[PDB]
């Protein structure tokens, strides 16, 4: 028998995910011996014919521009948001028959660590949601996008990655071209949502459910603060106002009485359910690579492992090399 | 304890699931309907309307407007299945008796992840990668599920399809011969894995579908329900594609997870036929002449009164 953890590093774009990730990976790190499983980039790029990173912002562009209808511009766009998603649900599909189950806080250092750039939470309800205050995408886009969030088996761990704006700002600028244009509405819209998918975790492991305080909340000005840098942050006791759940009481999903119909609150119960097992943490990314890695690797005594065999285990070390030379740019 | 068997009514539309559905519901049984008011009425877009509309190309934009519908399509089906799969309890068995409870449900997750698109990239009105991206987001049947694909003579069913439309109307009659031959396929993707074998079983010695094998997949007839079908006769050989396969001709890895996938979340879907030829009333009682045949799983009171709750609800908010 071999004891695992697995953490999905997750957060904004810029912050410095993935070099913490490589570094942890690396092996000059110390620790437990680790798997890294890189953005599913080629896939995105270079296995179809067709590149998703230049139609998402590009119908950005020719809406602007006025090249293709407003209407036609919220549906393309939706496609390729759709398409961001396809291999980290494969991924998932594939890994979670290794992981195992008895899912527990052992404290101890695993026999083997995996690590993962992205949960399958950021192209299915963080990016959308985003785009959705933005007012780029519907709710029914979104609803579309947030259903196909799949279920957390049990002891999952996600890490999501801070940094204060300067030098998140700044660590983007440094990667940019000439004097390109950086987009600081989407990051502070974006910066926004992480801590929304913070507090949301937070609210469903202290017991709490989305209609404890449902009644009570304001319909969602909701999407004025969203977008406002700073608005939302990591908060102690969250209440449902710093959670995910707020964005869903609009209009457009209520009565004409004003409550919400009975499908769209399943929808919220199978959002909760979903991330229900996901054990979450911050970590800080101030620092070099090497001291990026030794923040998330000291949350490990905290973190949760499943026991899985060594058959398995030799499973996912063939995963990841397969994955690691599959998706290369 | 409650024992529960439920039953996927699916198939190519126009055929008459629904009205056999109805009439099932008049052994207790519910019934829940297709979710139309969340696809035409719940909100500004109208996704029958626009899959439609925007086959006003009659060529690759369309591809990416109708692909984007199809995931429309499937939205409130996850979310039932999301409900539902909680309730229905486990201890999957053909125990052979009459259950305390019967669910019809109109059509499985299976049909807008997989059917009508899913590699519906057949009739070229959708890509490959479209239909990975589909094909990923349907979900895993937990044990004890049951799924009954409707056949119908096809003058029979063309001839419904007809007493059904109006002045100047039409029957996209390709798409219904495309969409016959896909549930065929279906139904023998289930025989296959019930057989015991694997999408690998065969796969080096089949031939790569390209081009060919698309026109062949669009032709009225051209698949049939067999109990020991070939690898050929199944989902699985239209992912043999130049598409999916590096330089040396082996698929790649990340596609062969997704094949796996695909297999292991039809693996609890025990596959049943109907033929839907008589009277609505003789429909539903061939349905119902199944029903010792199929898987029962045991639920609590509490789940079973969910359940009830559950198709009130959808039969209050998902019509018109």
Same mark, same amino acid.
């Given at each position: #028998? ?25 092996? !000059? ?22 590149? $998703? ?10 809406? +602007? +521009? ?7 511009? !919220?549906?393309?766009?939706? *496609? ?11 991924? =998932?599909? *594939? ?14 250092? %695993? ?13 299915? $309800?963080?990016? %959308? &949601? ?13 609803? !579309? ?5 799949? /279920?957390? %088996?049990?002891?999952?761990?996600? $890490? ?7 030098? *998140? ?7 940019? /071209?000439?004097?390109? +244009? ?13 801590? #929304?998918?913070?507090?949301?975790? =937070? ?6 459910? @989305?209609?404890?305080? @449902? ?8 999407? =004025?603060?969203?977008? +406002? ?27 004409? /009485? ?5 499908? =769209? &609150? @399943?929808?919220?119960?199978?959002? #909760? ?46 995963? !990841?090399?397969?994955?690691? &030379?599959? #998706?290369? $740019?």
């Amino acid at each position: #028998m071999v004891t695992i953890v697995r953490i999905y590093l997750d957060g904004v774009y810029g912050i410095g995910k993935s070099t913490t990730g490589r570094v942890m990976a690396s092996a !000059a790190s110390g620790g437990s011996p680790t798997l890294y499983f890189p953005e599913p980039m080629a896939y995105w790029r270079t296995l179809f014919e067709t590149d $998703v990173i230049s139609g998402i912002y590009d119908t950005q562009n020719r809406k +602007q +521009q006025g090249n293709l209808a407003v209407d036609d511009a !919220a549906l393309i766009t939706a *496609h390729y948001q759709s398409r961001f998603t396809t291999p980290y649900l494969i991924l =998932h599909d *594939h890994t979670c028959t290794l992981f195992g189950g008895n899912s527990l806080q052992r404290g101890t250092q %695993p026999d083997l660590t995996l690590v993962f750039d992205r949960h399958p939470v950021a192209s299915t $309800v963080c990016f %959308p &949601a985003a785009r959705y205050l933005l007012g780029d995408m519907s709710m029914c886009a979104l609803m !579309a996008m947030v259903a196909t969030l799949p /279920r957390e %088996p049990q002891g999952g761990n996600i $890490v999501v990655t801070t940094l204060n704006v300067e030098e *998140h700002i700044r660590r983007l600028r440094t990667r940019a /071209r000439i004097g390109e +244009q950086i987009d600081i509405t989407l990051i502070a819209t974006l910066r926004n949502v992480y801590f #929304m998918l913070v507090n949301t975790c =937070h609210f469903l492991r202290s017991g709490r459910v @989305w209609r404890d305080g @449902w009644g009570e909340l304001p319909t969602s000005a909701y999407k =004025h603060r969203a977008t +406002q840098m700073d608005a939302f942050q990591e908060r102690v006791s969250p209440e449902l106002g710093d959670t995910l759940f707020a964005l869903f009481k609009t209009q457009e999903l209520l009565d004409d /009485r004003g409550v919400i119909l009975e499908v =769209h &609150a @399943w929808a919220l119960d199978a959002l #909760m359910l979903k991330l229900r097992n996901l054990n979450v943490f911050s970590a800080d990314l101030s620092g070099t690579p090497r001291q990026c890695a030794a923040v998330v690797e000291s949350l490990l005594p905290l973190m949760s492992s499943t026991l899985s065999d060594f058959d398995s285990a030799s499973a996912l070390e063939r995963a !990841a090399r397969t994955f690691n &030379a599959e #998706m290369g $740019v």
